[PDB]
Design an enzyme around this catalytic site. Structure first.
Site, PDB file in Angstrom:
ATOM      1  N   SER A   1      19.484   5.764  34.836  1.00 50.19           N
ATOM      2  CA  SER A   1      18.167   5.118  34.936  1.00 50.19           C
ATOM      3  C   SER A   1      18.142   3.771  34.207  1.00 50.19           C
ATOM      4  O   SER A   1      17.417   3.617  33.221  1.00 50.19           O
ATOM      5  CB  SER A   1      17.050   6.035  34.361  1.00 50.19           C
ATOM      6  OG  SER A   1      17.158   7.386  34.804  1.00 50.19           O
TER       7      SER A   1
ATOM      8  N   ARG B   1      22.009  -4.737  33.719  1.00 51.09           N
ATOM      9  CA  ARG B   1      21.710  -4.985  32.295  1.00 51.09           C
ATOM     10  C   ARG B   1      21.290  -3.722  31.562  1.00 51.09           C
ATOM     11  O   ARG B   1      20.596  -2.878  32.122  1.00 51.09           O
ATOM     12  CB  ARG B   1      20.641  -6.061  32.094  1.00 51.09           C
ATOM     13  CG  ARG B   1      21.219  -7.473  31.968  1.00 51.09           C
ATOM     14  CD  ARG B   1      20.367  -8.347  31.084  1.00 51.09           C
ATOM     15  NE  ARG B   1      20.624  -9.769  31.301  1.00 51.09           N
ATOM     16  CZ  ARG B   1      19.721 -10.718  31.072  1.00 51.09           C
ATOM     17  NH1 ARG B   1      18.522 -10.375  30.618  1.00 51.09           N
ATOM     18  NH2 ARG B   1      20.008 -11.998  31.300  1.00 51.09           N
TER      19      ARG B   1
ATOM     20  N   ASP C   1      16.527   8.405  39.976  1.00 48.36           N
ATOM     21  CA  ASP C   1      15.799   9.693  39.934  1.00 48.36           C
ATOM     22  C   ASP C   1      14.906  10.039  41.198  1.00 48.36           C
ATOM     23  O   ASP C   1      14.891  11.177  41.651  1.00 48.36           O
ATOM     24  CB  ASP C   1      15.031   9.840  38.598  1.00 48.36           C
ATOM     25  CG  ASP C   1      13.787   8.979  38.530  1.00 48.36           C
ATOM     26  OD1 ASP C   1      13.841   7.738  38.759  1.00 48.36           O
ATOM     27  OD2 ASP C   1      12.719   9.559  38.281  1.00 48.36           O
TER      28      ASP C   1
END
Length: 469
Positions: free
Chosen positions: A141, A156, A194
């Protein structure tokens, strides 16, 4: 407390500002359809429409043991899923604290620790050993791109993570390498968002599922499109992924209507946007996320104070603070069971140092209801756009997120929203052709099931991504 005429007139005013009719919903859904289409045809329409690289529906007959790794802010969750082959599954899980000194980050200590955790897990749940290697799905995530399901190139770091030399690198072989060094029998076969997991896990246990939806602090949607309808993949796909192939899509539709052409923004919504860290971004999210519902109420109340209607002689020095009212405000207020709205009275006196009259509390309660109902009506426009785009007349829409789960009446608000859009003559929500149901665990179960589907293709020598990747 009977509402004074001047205050009743303001409530009618708030109703005209915040109510969303059937017909408006339908016009919003129409624009949303061509924005989803546009995201599928071109890189960088305002709606990303990211291929999730799942190219089959689970049948519900899959069996076997599958792992998921859910890497979090302070926890790593490791989930084992046992698929029973009848749309059924058992599960168990462990969570591990990630140690203080290695979030601050060598890439190799991060993965050695994740690996050491998976080893501990595998030795506890397979103390005799594993016959065959367990496939693992990784819910990762953090901003990442993938050109195949078994890859995630980190754009990032986020959330206190500052690990050098991971960014710009595929995390899967980094993790896979440390697994091999520990001689753990696991292969990392999928990295997902997710929400993509929310769709596929729910579809495994519920074959009417047509969409996975997250309504929380953030908003997201995932559904299956078809390859011939994804123009931006033309020329990119290997021979065994043809025009008839399904394709799971992670929408990221929070940026829907950044142009501001269709959403019925009020002057309060325009302020939220201008004052936000990114004006002109995340338009749909700003109008549906549970994160802004309190700020909306705050600006409205402040405006009514400023015009002379309410909170006369009160201290507004807390009210004046941006984001002082979080999602717990409209939530508590809608839940207030007292005739004289005592929970609302306690919240305002205690937290905001404002003493309210009962008539003010009636206005405040009506406002919370308006803001929450509006949020739900707009959310279902995303639902109706996916359904109408794909010609789904019946659907289970698998939902999760703190708003769907915890916000009072949320499910009743959404269901009435669908019923008004489609104009059904059906008494009860449970019987709506298109209805929202509680999702299965997306980041855990969903990842393990995706790992299952992906393994079916890999084992066959079949592609799970862009040609030549």
């Amino acid at each position: 407390a009977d509402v004074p005429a001047n205050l009743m007139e303001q409530i009618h005013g708030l109703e005209t500002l915040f109510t969303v009719s059937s017909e408006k919903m339908r016009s919003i859904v129409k624009h949303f359809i061509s924005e989803l289409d546009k995201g599928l045809s071109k890189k960088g329409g305002n709606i990303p429409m990211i291929p999730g690289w799942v190219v089959e529906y689970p049948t519900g007959k899959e069996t076997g043991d599958f792992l998921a790794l859910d890497l979090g802010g302070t926890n790593l969750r490791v989930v084992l899923v046992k698929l029973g082959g009848n749309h059924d599954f058992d599960t168990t899980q462990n969570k591990y604290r990630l140690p203080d000194h290695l979030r601050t980050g060598t890439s190799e200590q991060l993965w050695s620790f994740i690996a050491k955790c998976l080893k501990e897990f595998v030795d506890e749940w397979y103390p005799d050993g594993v016959s065959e290697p367990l496939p693992l799905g990784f819910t990762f995530s953090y901003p990442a791109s993938q050109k195949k399901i078994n890859s995630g190139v980190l754009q990032r770091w986020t959330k206190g993570f500052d690990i050098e030399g991971v960014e710009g690198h595929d995390v899967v072989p980094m993790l896979q390498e440390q697994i091999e060094k520990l001689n753990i029998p696991i292969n990392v076969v999928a990295l997902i968002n997710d929400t993509t997991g929310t769709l596929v896990a729910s579809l495994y246990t519920d074959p009417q599922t047509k969409m996975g939806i997250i309504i929380g602090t953030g908003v997201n949607g995932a559904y299956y499109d078809v390859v011939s309808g994804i123009e931006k993949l033309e020329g990119l796909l290997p021979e065994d992924i043809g025009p008839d192939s399904p394709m799971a899509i992670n929408c990221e539709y929070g940026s829907f209507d950044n142009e501001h052409l269709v959403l019925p923004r009020t002057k309060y919504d325009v302020i939220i946007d201008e004052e936000s860290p990114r004006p002109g971004q995340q338009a749909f999210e700003k109008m549906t996320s549970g994160y802004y519902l309190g700020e909306i109420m705050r600006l409205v109340l402040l405006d009514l104070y400023d015009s002379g209607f309410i909170f006369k002689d009160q201290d507004i020095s807390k009210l004046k603070e941006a984001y002082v009212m979080d999602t717990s405000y409209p939530s508590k207020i809608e839940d207030d069971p007292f005739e004289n709205l005592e929970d609302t009275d306690d919240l305002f006196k205690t937290n905001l140092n404002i003493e309210t009259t009962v008539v003010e509390r009636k206005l405040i309660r009506k406002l919370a209801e308006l803001v929450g109902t509006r949020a739900a009506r707009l959310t279902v426009c995303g639902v109706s756009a996916i359904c109408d785009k794909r010609g789904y007349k019946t659907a289970h829409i698998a939902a999760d997120g703190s708003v769907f789960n915890r916000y009072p009446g949320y499910k009743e608000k959404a269901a009435q929203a669908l019923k008004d859009i489609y104009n059904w003559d059906v008494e009860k929500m449970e019987d709506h052709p298109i209805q929202l149901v509680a999702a299965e665990d997306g980041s855990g179960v969903g990842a393990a099931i995706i790992a299952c589907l992906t393994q079916k293709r890999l084992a066959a020598g079949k592609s799970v991504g862009i040609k030549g990747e």
